Amino acid sequence: XXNXXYX
Ligand SMILES: *[C@@H]1O[C@H](CO)[C@@H](O)[C@H](O)[C@H]1O[C@H]1C[C@](C)(N)[C@H](O)[C@H](C)O1
Ligand SMILES: [Cl-]
């Protein structure tokens, strides 16, 4: 998975 951004 992961995630991230930046928004
Ligand atoms: C975001 O993820 C990458 C992993 O590839 C790390 O290298 C990066 O340092 C990390 O960003 C940090 C710094 C930030 C953007 N302020 C946030 O705290 C994120 C969660 O962590
Ligand atoms: Cl991302």
Phi-psi region of 2 (alpha: psi -120 to 50; beta: other; left: phi over 0): left
At 5, list the tokens.
Answer: 């951004």
Q: Find out whether the peptide bond into 6 is cis, omega within 30 degrees of 0.
A: yes
Centre of ligand 1 from the C-alpha of residue 6, in Å = 9
Cα separation, 6 vs 1, whole angstroms: 16
Place of tokens 């995630």: 3
Q: What is the resolution of this structure in A?
A: 1.0
Which method was used? Answer: electron diffraction
Place of tokens 């930046």: 6
Residue type, 2: X
Centre of ligand 2 from the C-alpha of residue 1, in Å = 11
Q: Which residues of 1-7 are buried (b: 16+ CB within 10 A; e: fewer)?
A: eeeeeee
Nearest ligand for residue 5 CA? 2
Cα separation, 6 vs 4, whole angstroms: 6
Cα separation, 1 vs 4, whole angstroms: 10
Centre of ligand 1 from the C-alpha of residue 4, in Å = 8
Q: What are phi and psi of 6, to 5 degrees?
A: -105, 150
Residue type, 4: X
